[PDB]
Amino acid sequence: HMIREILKMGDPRLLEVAKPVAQFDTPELHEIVADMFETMHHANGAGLAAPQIGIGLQIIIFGFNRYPDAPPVPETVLINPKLEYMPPDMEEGWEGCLSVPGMRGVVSRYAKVRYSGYDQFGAKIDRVAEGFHARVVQHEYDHLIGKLYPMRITDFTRFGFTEVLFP
Amino acid sequence: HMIREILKMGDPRLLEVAKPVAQFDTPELHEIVADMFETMHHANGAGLAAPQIGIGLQIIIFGFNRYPDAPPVPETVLINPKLEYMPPDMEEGWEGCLSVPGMRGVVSRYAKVRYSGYDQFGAKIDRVAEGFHARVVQHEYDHLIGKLYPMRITDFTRFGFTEVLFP
């Protein structure tokens, strides 16, 4: 497992739409997943998307005080995700992104989503998530469609540097 | 002349509306202006607004390859500015802000503005500016009404970190 560089906002690769994975359970795919977990763990992230390490594929991983009611979710590998948003209940919360280092912003997310897809072995995944779990999945899914969380912000008075917002 | 700390985005003082200066040509006002120029010069800025150093007053200073056609404008102190925007001609250009370190974004500005106000001696100032000159004045004026340039951005695909946007 190797630590890969995380691309920063401004890199046009973060704006592309990731392509689907076609072949499952390959040594190449296991290596990518392992590299992503090493990279995520090293930066103390709750999730990571393959475009963030320069891999333009529909692969996300996740697993983990601002959300003290959140149960722990075991590490998950989600490939070719299909999300279903569940209107109308939205929640505001603070987000940061490893591709936007040093900053936080308030982002509205669906309180609940369904997500499905496949793990790196090609096994089906199908879950309903709420709260922080749902927020992490939405944040990582956004990375696969070229969206970073400042694109989701509507109140830029609540966007700024972590050191100043939370001293 | 002393160098003051520049407040970073997230500090609620940058969102306040600055109060007008009431007394001109005082030792206190000259000291502020001197501190602002020392702070601006030190960060290699083209302008600075008093709220950026924690002074909630309508004081801006400015003076100075992305705008190679721009003539030099001598240092200016502008107090209680009154801007007139001149529609319809707008220009896009890259901006950075000392209160948003490490980032750049594309911002639409009026190509031309009129600005008036007073210098630190109480002498009237009244000018028409275009191009980069007009852009700097708009950027600094925004600081006095609680606006930072990410609030002006409409295309967040052209917002990111300088090191990545301009390597």
Ligand SMILES: CCCCC[C@H](CC(=O)NO)C(=O)N[C@H](C(=O)N1CCC[C@H]1CO)C(C)C
């Ligand atoms: C919350 C939605 C974002 C989850 C994923 C991000 C990591 C990332 O950039 N994924 O693409 C993260 O862990 N962000 C963390 C984050 O935002 N946290 C961690 C705890 C609470 C919240 C900050 O309010 C920190 C490490 C920046």
Ligand SMILES: CCCCC[C@H](CC(=O)NO)C(=O)N[C@H](C(=O)N1CCC[C@H]1CO)C(C)C
């Ligand atoms: C252009 C509108 C902004 C002018 C004022 C800012 C400084 C500032 O934050 N004032 O409040 C500046 O000098 N910004 C510079 C800036 O944006 N420049 C300098 C040359 C060209 C342009 C970058 O595209 C750098 C130092 C960040």
Ligand SMILES: [Zn+2]
């Ligand atoms: Zn992220």
Ligand SMILES: [Zn+2]
């Ligand atoms: Zn500025």
